[PDB]
Enzyme design. Sequence first.
Site, PDB file in Angstrom:
ATOM      1  N   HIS A  51      27.021  46.214  45.544  1.00 43.71           N
ATOM      2  CA  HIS A  51      28.268  46.852  45.092  1.00 43.71           C
ATOM      3  C   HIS A  51      28.794  46.161  43.840  1.00 43.71           C
ATOM      4  O   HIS A  51      29.662  46.699  43.156  1.00 43.71           O
ATOM      5  CB  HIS A  51      29.325  46.882  46.178  1.00 43.71           C
ATOM      6  CG  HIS A  51      29.654  45.591  46.820  1.00 43.71           C
ATOM      7  ND1 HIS A  51      29.058  45.191  48.002  1.00 43.71           N
ATOM      8  CD2 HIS A  51      30.505  44.596  46.462  1.00 43.71           C
ATOM      9  CE1 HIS A  51      29.539  44.005  48.338  1.00 43.71           C
ATOM     10  NE2 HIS A  51      30.417  43.619  47.423  1.00 43.71           N
ATOM     11  N   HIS A  97      32.399  37.654  39.965  1.00 44.27           N
ATOM     12  CA  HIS A  97      31.799  38.981  39.867  1.00 44.27           C
ATOM     13  C   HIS A  97      32.732  39.849  39.020  1.00 44.27           C
ATOM     14  O   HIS A  97      33.833  39.385  38.696  1.00 44.27           O
ATOM     15  CB  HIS A  97      31.572  39.626  41.255  1.00 44.27           C
ATOM     16  CG  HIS A  97      32.895  39.762  41.974  1.00 44.27           C
ATOM     17  ND1 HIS A  97      33.393  38.765  42.793  1.00 44.27           N
ATOM     18  CD2 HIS A  97      33.821  40.763  41.987  1.00 44.27           C
ATOM     19  CE1 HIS A  97      34.577  39.146  43.269  1.00 44.27           C
ATOM     20  NE2 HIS A  97      34.844  40.351  42.792  1.00 44.27           N
ATOM     21  N   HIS A 131      34.295  44.067  38.337  1.00 48.98           N
ATOM     22  CA  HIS A 131      34.457  45.485  38.612  1.00 48.98           C
ATOM     23  C   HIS A 131      34.544  46.225  37.277  1.00 48.98           C
ATOM     24  O   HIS A 131      35.189  45.724  36.333  1.00 48.98           O
ATOM     25  CB  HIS A 131      35.717  45.780  39.427  1.00 48.98           C
ATOM     26  CG  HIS A 131      35.803  44.915  40.663  1.00 48.98           C
ATOM     27  ND1 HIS A 131      35.492  45.400  41.917  1.00 48.98           N
ATOM     28  CD2 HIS A 131      36.141  43.603  40.823  1.00 48.98           C
ATOM     29  CE1 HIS A 131      35.651  44.436  42.817  1.00 48.98           C
ATOM     30  NE2 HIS A 131      36.028  43.343  42.179  1.00 48.98           N
ATOM     31  N   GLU A 143      40.799  46.693  38.482  1.00 49.09           N
ATOM     32  CA  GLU A 143      41.397  46.965  39.787  1.00 49.09           C
ATOM     33  C   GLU A 143      42.910  46.837  39.683  1.00 49.09           C
ATOM     34  O   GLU A 143      43.640  47.763  40.046  1.00 49.09           O
ATOM     35  CB  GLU A 143      40.842  45.995  40.839  1.00 49.09           C
ATOM     36  CG  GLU A 143      39.320  46.134  40.971  1.00 49.09           C
ATOM     37  CD  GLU A 143      38.874  45.767  42.379  1.00 49.09           C
ATOM     38  OE1 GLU A 143      38.430  46.678  43.100  1.00 49.09           O
ATOM     39  OE2 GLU A 143      38.991  44.590  42.766  1.00 49.09           O
ATOM     40  N   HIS A 174      36.579  38.528  38.472  1.00 47.69           N
ATOM     41  CA  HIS A 174      37.202  37.816  39.598  1.00 47.69           C
ATOM     42  C   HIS A 174      36.466  36.502  39.823  1.00 47.69           C
ATOM     43  O   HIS A 174      35.252  36.556  40.071  1.00 47.69           O
ATOM     44  CB  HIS A 174      37.136  38.675  40.869  1.00 47.69           C
ATOM     45  CG  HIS A 174      38.096  39.837  40.813  1.00 47.69           C
ATOM     46  ND1 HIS A 174      37.997  40.951  41.615  1.00 47.69           N
ATOM     47  CD2 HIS A 174      39.175  40.043  40.022  1.00 47.69           C
ATOM     48  CE1 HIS A 174      38.986  41.801  41.336  1.00 47.69           C
ATOM     49  NE2 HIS A 174      39.723  41.264  40.349  1.00 47.69           N
ATOM     50  N   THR A 187      39.558  42.961  47.818  1.00 47.77           N
ATOM     51  CA  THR A 187      39.675  44.377  47.449  1.00 47.77           C
ATOM     52  C   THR A 187      38.435  45.141  47.913  1.00 47.77           C
ATOM     53  O   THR A 187      38.289  46.310  47.578  1.00 47.77           O
ATOM     54  CB  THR A 187      39.822  44.584  45.937  1.00 47.77           C
ATOM     55  OG1 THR A 187      38.636  44.065  45.338  1.00 47.77           O
ATOM     56  CG2 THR A 187      41.024  43.817  45.375  1.00 47.77           C
TER      57      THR A 187
HETATM   58  N1  LIG Z   1      37.167  41.663  44.767  1.00 46.40           N
HETATM   59  S1  LIG Z   1      37.425  40.328  45.581  1.00 46.40           S
HETATM   60  O1  LIG Z   1      38.595  40.469  46.395  1.00 46.40           O
HETATM   61  O2  LIG Z   1      37.484  39.182  44.760  1.00 46.40           O
HETATM   62  C1  LIG Z   1      36.145  40.108  46.626  1.00 46.40           C
HETATM   63  N2  LIG Z   1      35.305  41.078  47.026  1.00 46.40           N
HETATM   64  N3  LIG Z   1      34.158  40.589  47.707  1.00 46.40           N
HETATM   65  C2  LIG Z   1      34.184  39.238  47.810  1.00 46.40           C
HETATM   66  N4  LIG Z   1      33.210  38.518  48.425  1.00 46.40           N
HETATM   67  S2  LIG Z   1      33.317  37.138  49.036  1.00 46.40           S
HETATM   68  O3  LIG Z   1      34.464  36.309  48.709  1.00 46.40           O
HETATM   69  O4  LIG Z   1      32.062  36.397  48.748  1.00 46.40           O
HETATM   70  C3  LIG Z   1      33.432  37.405  50.624  1.00 46.40           C
HETATM   71  C4  LIG Z   1      32.271  37.572  51.360  1.00 46.40           C
HETATM   72  C5  LIG Z   1      32.394  37.755  52.742  1.00 46.40           C
HETATM   73  C6  LIG Z   1      33.660  37.763  53.319  1.00 46.40           C
HETATM   74  C7  LIG Z   1      34.818  37.570  52.570  1.00 46.40           C
HETATM   75  C8  LIG Z   1      34.694  37.376  51.197  1.00 46.40           C
HETATM   76  S3  LIG Z   1      35.562  38.541  47.080  1.00 46.40           S
HETATM   77 ZN   LIG Z   2      36.509  41.504  42.942  1.00 50.98          ZN
END
Ligand SMILES: NS(=O)(=O)c1nnc(NS(=O)(=O)c2ccccc2)s1
Ligand SMILES: [Zn+2]
Length: 257
Positions: free
Chosen positions: A61, A91, A93, A103, A116, A195
């Site tokens: 994703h 990462h 978006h 976002e 992020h 998010t």
């Molecule tokens: N967009 S955002 O809020 O920064 C995130 N979206 N996915 C994320 N992945 S992560 O921090 O590695 C993660 C992975 C598993 C559980 C909780 C968080 S952070």
């Molecule tokens: Zn993010």
Amino acid sequence: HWGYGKHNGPEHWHKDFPIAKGERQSPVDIDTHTAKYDPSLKPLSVSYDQATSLRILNNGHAFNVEFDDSQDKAVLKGGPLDGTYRLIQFHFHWGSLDGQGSEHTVDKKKYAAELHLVHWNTKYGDFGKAVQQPDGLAVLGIFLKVGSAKPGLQKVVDVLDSIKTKGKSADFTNFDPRGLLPESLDYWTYPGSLTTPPLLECVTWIVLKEPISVSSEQVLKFRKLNFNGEGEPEELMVDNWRPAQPLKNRQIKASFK
Ligand SMILES: NS(=O)(=O)c1nnc(NS(=O)(=O)c2ccccc2)s1
Ligand SMILES: [Zn+2]
């Protein structure tokens, strides 16, 4: 499985993750005229000089760049935070068009993409424990606008062809995330959530006021990634952003006036 398409996108997440309709979800629109300047807020302290990147992964994703977080190498302190937060991954978006992709929004304005930088609170010992706490994560958000190229980003852009489909990964050592920061560290902050599913409400959001600029060519390379696994029908990785959620009983605070 959840995703960003018409049949499994953000509007559907709440059926598997009912917290999607929670009290402090993200992201949310930052209304600059109702954000409150808070003189008590401290400057951010970003200490990334000893960061150790490990690899880059297409997780179906987004793509994540991962860091070694076994020690206090790359940390975030200060601002609204209490304690030390370790960088574990960053990462992006982004959108299918340059007028959308972020976002968070600022006075309803959308940016081309949003970076992020995800950090976790070391007092909880490991990342899995931190995501179960209301102050367990701190995410630094940085807007991208299309303009002049960002030299610091090109190392990332050049390896994307190696991880085009879901589950692909590549070694990605000696990347310095300092090259992704704007000049100013002025910010907005509010209590929010991840998010993407599981949408946990464990995040202190810190969103930088100043965007960084990237070229059209740089963002175009983002849009050539794939949501699907190799051998599967091709679906381009675009518009992997969640729309703004209601602010509810929250105040956004500004570090600047
Ligand atoms: N967009 S955002 O809020 O920064 C995130 N979206 N996915 C994320 N992945 S992560 O921090 O590695 C993660 C992975 C598993 C559980 C909780 C968080 S952070
Ligand atoms: Zn993010």
